């Protein structure tokens, strides 16, 4: 359960950043 | 039109709620 | 241990809730 | 607002499929 929790934090941050970018580019 | 504007506004609002829900979840749980 | 098991179970449950919430949202709104 | 709504359906389906895969692979 070590670096996988850290790996999860990074994927979730990336997922939200992507979603925000998509929204702004559309409007 | 008219209903096209309403559906577009509804879809925008729902996506804004999706972002806010994801942000809250990330900040509280990580 | 003990609290390691509880936190692991909690994290698993939360991820299961994340999936169910996303599925519901997809099916109802698309 | 044409094919972008269709484009959104496909990204969301892909996002859920990915999340389910990640969960199953972990346990
Ligand atoms: Cl997502």
Numbering used by the authors:
A (entry chain B), D (entry chain B): 5 to 31
B (entry chain A), C (entry chain A): 2 to 31
Sentences copied from the publication:
Human cathelicidin comprises the cathelin precursor domain and LL-37 as C-terminal extension. LL-37 is activated through proteolytic cleavage as a mature peptide43 comprising 37 amino acids including two N-terminal leucines and a net positive charge of + 6.
In our new crystallization attempts of LL-37 in 1% DPC crystals were formed in the presence of 70% MPD. Notably, this channel does not follow an exact twofold symmetry along the crystallographic channel axis. Disordered residues are observed at both termini resulting in an ordered channel core structure only comprising residues Phe6 to Asn30. Although narrow, the channel shows a continuous and charged inner cavity between the terminal pores with a constriction at the centre. Due to this asymmetric arrangement three different peptide interfaces (IF1, IF2 and IF3) are formed, two of which (IF1) are identical dimer interfaces stabilized by the hydrophobic residues Ile13, Phe17, Ile20, Ile24, Phe27 and Leu31 (interface area 445 Å2—see Fig. 1A). The IF2 is stabilized by four hydrophilic residue pairs Lys15/Asn30 and Arg19/Asp26 (contact area 344 Å2). In the interior of the channel-like structure a chloride ion is trapped by two Arg23 residues from adjacent monomers and further coordinated by two water molecules.
